[PDB]
Amino acid sequence: MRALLPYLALYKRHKWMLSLGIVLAIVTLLASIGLLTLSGWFLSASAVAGVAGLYSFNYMLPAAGVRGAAITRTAGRYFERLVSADATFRVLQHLRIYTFSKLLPLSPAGLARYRQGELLNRVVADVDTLDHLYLRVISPLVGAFVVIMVVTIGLSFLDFTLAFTLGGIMLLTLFLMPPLFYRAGKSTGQNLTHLRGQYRQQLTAWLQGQAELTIFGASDRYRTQLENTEIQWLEAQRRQSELTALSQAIMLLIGALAVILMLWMASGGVGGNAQPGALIALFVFCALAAFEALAPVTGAFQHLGQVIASAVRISDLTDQKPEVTFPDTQTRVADRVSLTLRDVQFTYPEQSQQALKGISLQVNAGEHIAILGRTGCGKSTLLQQLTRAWDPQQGEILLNDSPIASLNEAALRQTISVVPQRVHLFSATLRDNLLLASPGSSDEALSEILRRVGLEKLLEDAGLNSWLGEGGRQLSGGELRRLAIARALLHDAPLVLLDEPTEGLDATTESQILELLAEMMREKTVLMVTHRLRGLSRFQQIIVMDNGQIIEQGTHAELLARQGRYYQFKQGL
Amino acid sequence: SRQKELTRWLKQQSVISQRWLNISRLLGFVSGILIIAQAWFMARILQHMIMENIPREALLLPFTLLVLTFVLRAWVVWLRERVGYHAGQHIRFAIRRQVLDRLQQAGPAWIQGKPAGSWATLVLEQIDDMHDYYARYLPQMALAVSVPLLIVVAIFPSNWAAALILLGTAPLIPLFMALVGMGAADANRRNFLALARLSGHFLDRLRGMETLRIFGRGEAEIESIRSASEDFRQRTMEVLRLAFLSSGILEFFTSLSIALVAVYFGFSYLGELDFGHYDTGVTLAAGFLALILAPEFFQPLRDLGTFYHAKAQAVGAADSLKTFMETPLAHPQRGEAELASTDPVTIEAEELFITSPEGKTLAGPLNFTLPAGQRAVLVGRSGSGKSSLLNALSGFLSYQGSLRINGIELRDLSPESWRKHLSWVGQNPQLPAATLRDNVLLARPDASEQELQAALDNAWVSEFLPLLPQGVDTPVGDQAARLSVGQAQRVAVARALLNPCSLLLLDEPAASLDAHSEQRVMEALNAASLRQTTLMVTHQLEDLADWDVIWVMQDGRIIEQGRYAELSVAGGPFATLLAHRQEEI
Ligand SMILES: Nc1ncnc2c1ncn2[C@@H]1O[C@H](COP(=O)(O)OP(=O)(O)NP(=O)(O)O)[C@@H](O)[C@H]1O
Ligand SMILES: [Mg+2]
């Protein structure tokens, strides 16, 4: 349970809104008990007094107590429900900022180790479960505990041996029953999560392999196997409800025990009084109404296991050590970046020992460099090392006569503008998808770039206030490639890293992209990594890669004039 | 807007397990009698020792009867929860059975229209959203009309003023809930779009955290998360500020009814109020009966409010399950004509229009003929209808026209017997079985070990078995986790080479594979494509000179047809297509 400690410490902010939402739950839940315990005593006192005791009996004080207890019961529940719901959105904002502000330093490496699609859908769900700790767990458990301790203390002024048998019964089922039923259903709850995921994987394999199964005749054989898992899955769901049916029949019996005990024990006297009279009803009506406090306490303890499980997942994910660390110097960004690479590896080395020693290349200021790699032979890691996703274990990168590790992140992100292969379309306006590159750009400049890049089809509908992304319009490949280039032109960094810009594009759009790089990025030291030969003529100093090493180098005409691997590539195969 | 007919669908799905919903409605009536008996025994016991001063030892029968009604009342609560589950389980088991039946006879043509993670949501996470509608909400709606009428009927003979206090609030509660429910409906509609935008904001900034890093916008997206969370908080607090009044209307009238019953009975015991009783002194047991039962009058309404979320997400589940079960889609017809012989088949098409289950035409007019033992190649750009022809040839797609296999049309060919003569390899291989050995033997479970071992030798899968821990019987895992994409595709080749076939359809194998597995797959599949009629879709566009004919299509129509030599130099669409492949390394 020590897992919740980093997240309970997040409650120091908004510790008055959070405490108020619990106090309002106690006051509401005490007024419910007070309303019915005062009504029960008032009815008994009035009947005992009788008509002859109209004037002797002060009935106006209890009649103001029942009116006051009814107002704070109905006003308290409304305000407790507001503050609790308001304050659970304020800690959700803190949880959202806490995880995001802590997942940034380890974004490329340490967070992409998992499957990004499935992991990030669980990070969002787990922050939601951490958001449930206050209102699903802490508030019902704490509110029940001090409602029990106030009715026990309050009833101890009339009788002590009666306040503690009612308080002791309520304190026993507060502390003994929620853990006792969490232990009984732990085995089934584990057997339930296994069978749900087993049916999930058997159904996906059945649906995905429907073409395979139908042709080989096993479509109905694996459907029987799939149905047998559901039958086992449904049996484990009976046992989960057969234990919920028992935890509900026992809370009704325990609350019955505390009323029958109050009737029997309180009729023998309270404060040494031989005939308690109206004091009997004050105890049997407190016991009748005080078990509403314990109503949410069993389900609060069940959810605590989920909150703790979600606390471990977020903790062990956000507590990793970041790969790279940046200094703090605020060196002024310098234009005309002359990138230098010395013995740096280009591709993750294969068990085949592709290249123990890395590649070396000098990109002078203003030079446009293209790197040719074999398709499907490893993956290029030059951009991650240049973007400082991780530190290069071998070799070193010299960014304009200075090592790349001696730049603060503020300066490093300004000397390098990178267009990645996987271009992300943030669910926001077109202005917010472009001001991302340059926050201070004017309204005309963003539209000027879009016309100049060729995304003119994105300016007729609401202008730049068009919702692009999940809730809005999608962008096709090529229509999304020109957005990535649009940001890089807006970012205006001296060094530009292209990562297969013309990949998956038709020859009509692809020829337009290569013109964009040669025209706009005319003096921006382009370093491009591709698997195509369409427009390499305009680039200077083409670098051909084999097995993670440079086998050929030089200008397109210079490299084509001499027979070599580039000549074979140009002709075919 | 669709609530009325979605709920009609929900209420018609409950005909199965109608005895479970009838026992649960009858147990809610019995439970409302034990509540009344409980309050009557307590009221008589309390009056005896408060007014008549009878000792507790002389009240053993009412105490025994009171304990008995508590045990019976806890029994029906246990019984009603188990009966309620059985109601929900049997709809979920019957709806899922007929969702999987419809999703199987539709075949792979419709299944691949949506990702498998979205079908699992429909079958596994949305069908289960309907459980608490039948297990809890439907029984509680019966408890909300049965039990409260019992208290009013039980209190009315004793005192009509107390029963009028409880019955008087019966119309006043829905009146005020509807009065504030339409003030909370415009808040939903004027904040519907913004909350929809703001809900997926965190996951969006969390998926695109790579792009934020490379642009240095990490510290400026913390402020947007703050600004989006502040906006979402205060935008949805306006909705909740009005949604908590509706729940607070019920708490007002249960607070007013308990307070007003106490004041009416308290003042009538002192002589301040003479009305209400039937010309008889108000007894103390009458006041206790109405005071114990006053909170129980509104409890079924309070519990129903906690189960409304169950109805909300059952209708959302019925929103997507009703459309799925009523989509108009037609299946390929299955004539009963068994194929004549287990020999290579002569497939020929007069004029085909292969159509998706929803009626969309995938492949235009097709005019081709593949003689027995002739291996063809389909080439073309993406989206050109190449794979649609292989699915139609398998029976997965309906077609209009003439597509005759060995002289007999495909529409009147028995799918059970036609697919015994059909073996095929697809891209992105699917391995449904458990072990790698039982996955190869899926094609022919009755294969001998010497025939099985030959298939593994021919398919080049025994040369990476030693790398596997358990060898041939290695558990493949979920989505072929243990095997690489190149290694799994070789296992898919193994079960294609197991049974000899009259027609082999290779839908782009060795496309996304690694360099070595592409060589091994093609080599084992190029020597196996020349002993029976094959039909291979490929994008390699190279070393095809040994294939008999090449059919190139764009936009679903065969445009050029001939051998590799006569299309490479013809300068036609194939040469344009071939130039693109050589353009990229
Ligand atoms: N079962 C189906 N149901 C509905 N639409 C389909 C189906 N199969 C294909 N389509 C669509 O109809 C067209 C036919 O495409 P398709 O038959 O897949 O060509 P293709 O050659 O297989 N594409 P590719 O595999 O990338 O070369 C495309 O626009 C598909 O999106
Ligand atoms: Mg295809």
Side-chain angles (χ1 to χ4, degrees), chain A residues 75-134:
Chain A
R77 184 51 91 218
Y78 170 77
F79 282 126
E80 172 261 318
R81 263 199 318 249
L82 273 185
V83 178
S84 278
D86 169 37
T88 193
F89 289 138
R90 299 221 199 211
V91 298
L92 180 57
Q93 166 185 349
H94 201 169
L95 280 169
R96 287 203 200 290
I97 296 179
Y98 174 81
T99 64
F100 185 88
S101 180
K102 190 174 288 293
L103 286 174
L104 284 171
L106 72 164
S107 164
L111 173 54
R113 191 258 317 285
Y114 310 83
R115 178 79 152 168
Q116 175 257 349
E118 287 280 322
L119 172 76
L120 293 191
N121 269 128
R122 207 168 43 226
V123 175
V124 170
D126 282 5
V127 165
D128 267 325
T129 304
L130 270 299
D131 194 31
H132 296 169
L133 165 65
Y134 163 70

Side-chain angles (χ1 to χ4, degrees), chain B residues 1-3 5-10 95 122 126-127 129-130 311-327:
Chain B
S1 65
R2 209 140 65 92
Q3 304 292 109
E5 57 272 19
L6 291 184
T7 298
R8 175 154 70 77
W9 186 85
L10 275 178
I95 284 184
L122 184 66
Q126 277 200 327
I127 298 183
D129 272 356
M130 294 182 286
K311 182 178 180 179
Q313 79 190 25
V315 174
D319 197 359
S320 76
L321 272 170
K322 190 182 188 298
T323 69
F324 167 94
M325 291 295 308
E326 315 270 23
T327 50

Side-chain angles (χ1 to χ4, degrees), chain A residues 359-550:
Chain A
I359 72 165
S360 316
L361 56 88
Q362 170 96 10
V363 180
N364 318 289
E367 266 198 31
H368 289 65
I369 303 292
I371 285 163
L372 277 296
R374 203 48 180 282
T375 313
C377 202
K379 181 73 175 66
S380 163
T381 73
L382 194 45
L383 276 75
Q384 293 82 17
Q385 298 165 226
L386 276 178
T387 310
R388 280 264 275 157
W390 55 74
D391 279 329
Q393 56 184 357
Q394 74 153 333
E396 65 209 0
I397 296 90
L398 268 293
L399 203 72
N400 197 317
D401 197 26
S402 80
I404 197 165
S406 68
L407 288 150
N408 47 316
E409 187 159 5
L412 175 63
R413 306 303 176 205
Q414 292 263 320
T415 81
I416 302 190
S417 65
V418 58
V419 298
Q421 176 163 21
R422 189 177 314 107
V423 53
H424 186 79
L425 186 60
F426 283 94
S427 80
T429 57
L430 194 47
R431 191 184 304 101
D432 278 4
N433 282 336
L434 293 169
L435 290 182
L436 176 141
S438 79
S441 286
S442 297
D443 211 7
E444 292 96 50
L446 303 182
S447 63
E448 191 275 7
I449 286 291
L450 284 182
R451 299 190 319 260
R452 174 201 291 310
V453 171
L455 281 182
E456 276 271 32
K457 192 62 63 67
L458 298 204
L459 290 197
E460 81 274 10
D461 164 36
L464 291 170
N465 314 286
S466 299
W467 204 255
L468 287 86
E470 211 78 359
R473 58 173 303 171
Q474 311 313 291
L475 265 60
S476 57
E479 196 177 9
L480 204 56
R481 187 43 71 184
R482 306 174 87 164
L483 176 68
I485 295 175
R487 294 158 168 166
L489 292 179
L490 276 162
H491 195 32
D492 210 296
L495 173 82
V496 191
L497 316 175
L498 278 286
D499 178 36
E500 299 175 0
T502 58
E503 178 88 334
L505 264 54
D506 72 6
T508 304
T509 304
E510 155 179 348
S511 308
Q512 298 199 311
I513 300 299
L514 293 161
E515 202 295 329
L516 262 187
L517 319 175
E519 171 67 285
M520 291 306 288
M521 299 158 185
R522 177 152 275 144
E523 65 183 1
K524 285 199 173 321
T525 308
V526 171
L527 167 59
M528 170 166 106
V529 174
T530 61
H531 293 317
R532 306 165 79 90
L533 293 83
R534 165 74 187 82
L536 302 171
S537 88
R538 331 185 65 161
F539 276 78
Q540 300 95 20
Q541 174 74 290
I542 298 176
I543 298 180
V544 184
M545 301 285 318
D546 188 358
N547 214 337
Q549 288 204 165
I550 299 172

Side-chain angles (χ1 to χ4, degrees), chain A residues 41-339:
Chain A
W41 172 87
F42 182 53
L43 262 64
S44 304
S46 302
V48 165
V51 194
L54 188 153
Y55 298 103
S56 44
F57 182 75
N58 185 5
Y59 62 94
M60 283 315 254
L61 183 47
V66 300
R67 173 187 182 95
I71 285 176
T72 180
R73 180 198 187 282
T74 183
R77 184 51 91 218
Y78 170 77
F79 282 126
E80 172 261 318
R81 263 199 318 249
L82 273 185
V83 178
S84 278
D86 169 37
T88 193
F89 289 138
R90 299 221 199 211
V91 298
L92 180 57
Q93 166 185 349
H94 201 169
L95 280 169
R96 287 203 200 290
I97 296 179
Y98 174 81
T99 64
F100 185 88
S101 180
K102 190 174 288 293
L103 286 174
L104 284 171
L106 72 164
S107 164
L111 173 54
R113 191 258 317 285
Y114 310 83
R115 178 79 152 168
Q116 175 257 349
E118 287 280 322
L119 172 76
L120 293 191
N121 269 128
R122 207 168 43 226
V123 175
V124 170
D126 282 5
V127 165
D128 267 325
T129 304
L130 270 299
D131 194 31
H132 296 169
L133 165 65
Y134 163 70
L135 191 46
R136 309 268 193 104
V137 171
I138 289 176
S139 190
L141 285 170
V142 165
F145 174 75
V146 310
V147 161
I148 290 164
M149 292 309 293
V150 166
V151 302
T152 303
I153 281 176
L155 293 163
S156 72
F157 293 155
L158 320 170
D159 208 8
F160 204 110
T161 176
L162 279 172
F164 276 37
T165 180
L166 175 56
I169 281 177
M170 298 213 297
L171 269 191
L172 271 175
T173 82
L174 171 66
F175 286 117
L176 276 296
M177 184 185 76
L180 194 72
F181 277 98
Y182 182 71
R183 271 192 291 270
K186 194 172 51 43
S187 158
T188 295
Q190 289 167 359
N191 176 203
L192 205 62
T193 302
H194 164 72
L195 283 167
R196 185 213 164 267
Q198 157 161 335
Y199 184 88
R200 175 97 183 265
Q201 86 189 357
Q202 291 192 344
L203 172 81
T204 299
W206 184 75
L207 286 179
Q208 280 190 326
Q210 205 51 234
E212 286 68 64
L213 285 179
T214 300
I215 284 185
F216 297 126
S219 198
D220 279 299
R221 159 153 49 89
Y222 280 67
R223 177 196 168 83
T224 287
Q225 163 178 155
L226 180 63
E227 287 179 353
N228 283 1
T229 296
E230 176 189 23
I231 280 179
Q232 295 196 251
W233 182 25
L234 294 184
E235 280 181 6
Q237 287 188 282
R238 272 203 295 111
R239 296 199 301 263
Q240 169 155 285
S241 71
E242 278 174 4
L243 186 64
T244 299
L246 197 51
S247 88
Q248 279 178 192
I250 283 173
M251 281 295 278
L252 197 151
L253 282 187
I254 290 167
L257 181 74
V259 169
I260 298 163
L261 277 194
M262 279 305 108
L263 268 170
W264 186 271
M265 295 185 40
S267 75
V270 296
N273 192 337
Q275 53 167 6
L279 267 297
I280 301 179
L282 189 153
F283 277 94
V284 309
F285 273 95
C286 195
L288 207 57
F291 269 87
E292 201 206 30
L294 295 171
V297 72
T298 299
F301 206 78
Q302 304 263 359
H303 202 63
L304 177 59
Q306 298 209 0
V307 175
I308 283 182
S310 300
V312 171
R313 293 192 219 104
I314 296 308
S315 285
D316 72 16
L317 177 65
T318 61
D319 280 353
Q320 323 182 6
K321 300 289 94 175
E323 283 261 341
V324 306
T325 59
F326 290 84
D328 62 357
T329 300
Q330 291 182 357
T331 42
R332 185 155 181 77
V333 64
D335 43 351
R336 305 284 293 181
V337 164
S338 77
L339 167 75

Side-chain angles (χ1 to χ4, degrees), chain B residues 109 356-357 362 381-388 397 508:
Chain B
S356 64
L362 307 182
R381 64 175 65 257
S382 162
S384 168
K386 297 191 297 318
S387 291
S388 175
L397 276 172
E508 207 161 359

Side-chain angles (χ1 to χ4, degrees), chain A residues 36 39-40 42-44 46-48 50-51 54 59 70 73-74 78 81-82 86 89-90 93 96-97 99-101 103-104 107-108 111 116 120-121 124 196 199-200 203-204 206-208 211-212 214-216 218-223 227 230 233-234 237-238 241-242 244-245 248-249 252-253 256 260 263-264 267-268 275 277 280 284-285 288 373 375 387 413 418 424 426-427 436 439 467 470 487 510 531-534 569 573, chain B residues 42 46 49-51 53 56 60 63 66-67 70 73-74 77-78 81-82 85-86 89 92-93 96-97 100-101 103-104 108 111 116 119-120 123-125 128 197 202-215 217-218 222 225-226 229-230 233 236-237 241 244 247-248 251-252 254-255 258-259 262-263 266-267 269-270 272 284 287-288 291-292 396 419 422 424 430 432-433 442-443 478 495 542 580 582-585:
Chain A
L36 204 68
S39 304
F42 182 53
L43 262 64
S44 304
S46 302
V48 165
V51 194
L54 188 153
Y59 62 94
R73 180 198 187 282
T74 183
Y78 170 77
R81 263 199 318 249
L82 273 185
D86 169 37
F89 289 138
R90 299 221 199 211
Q93 166 185 349
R96 287 203 200 290
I97 296 179
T99 64
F100 185 88
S101 180
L103 286 174
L104 284 171
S107 164
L111 173 54
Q116 175 257 349
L120 293 191
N121 269 128
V124 170
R196 185 213 164 267
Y199 184 88
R200 175 97 183 265
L203 172 81
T204 299
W206 184 75
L207 286 179
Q208 280 190 326
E212 286 68 64
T214 300
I215 284 185
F216 297 126
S219 198
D220 279 299
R221 159 153 49 89
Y222 280 67
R223 177 196 168 83
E227 287 179 353
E230 176 189 23
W233 182 25
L234 294 184
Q237 287 188 282
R238 272 203 295 111
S241 71
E242 278 174 4
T244 299
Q248 279 178 192
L252 197 151
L253 282 187
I260 298 163
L263 268 170
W264 186 271
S267 75
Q275 53 167 6
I280 301 179
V284 309
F285 273 95
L288 207 57
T375 313
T387 310
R413 306 303 176 205
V418 58
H424 186 79
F426 283 94
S427 80
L436 176 141
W467 204 255
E470 211 78 359
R487 294 158 168 166
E510 155 179 348
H531 293 317
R532 306 165 79 90
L533 293 83
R534 165 74 187 82
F569 284 160
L573 264 175
Chain B
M42 272 155 75
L46 270 165
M49 64 183 73
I50 292 179
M51 292 303 303
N53 262 27
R56 63 206 204 190
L60 272 195
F63 272 100
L66 179 55
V67 175
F70 270 125
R73 187 171 168 248
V77 160
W78 172 83
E81 188 97 8
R82 306 202 322 149
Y85 171 85
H86 277 285
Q89 152 166 309
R92 275 180 329 164
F93 185 80
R96 189 179 279 126
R97 161 155 291 178
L100 293 185
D101 272 345
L103 188 62
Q104 170 182 8
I111 287 176
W119 285 128
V123 178
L124 194 140
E125 294 291 85
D128 289 354
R197 293 202 196 298
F202 184 57
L203 179 63
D204 171 52
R205 297 305 182 279
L206 199 66
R207 293 202 272 248
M209 201 155 37
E210 261 294 359
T211 301
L212 298 178
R213 187 184 68 80
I214 71 188
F215 282 105
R217 300 300 281 164
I222 282 171
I225 282 187
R226 176 173 311 124
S229 296
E230 292 277 348
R233 187 271 311 280
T236 197
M237 275 317 287
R241 176 159 300 114
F244 291 155
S247 313
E251 311 299 334
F252 172 81
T254 180
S255 301
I258 296 171
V263 175
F267 284 16
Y269 290 144
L270 304 164
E272 292 255 15
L284 184 59
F288 284 150
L291 188 72
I292 298 171
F396 302 150
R419 273 142 183 181
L422 184 83
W424 78 289
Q430 300 306 158
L442 185 53
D478 45 352
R495 48 154 149 91
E542 276 152 336
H580 181 285
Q582 302 176 328
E583 167 191 0
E584 158 181 19
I585 191 174

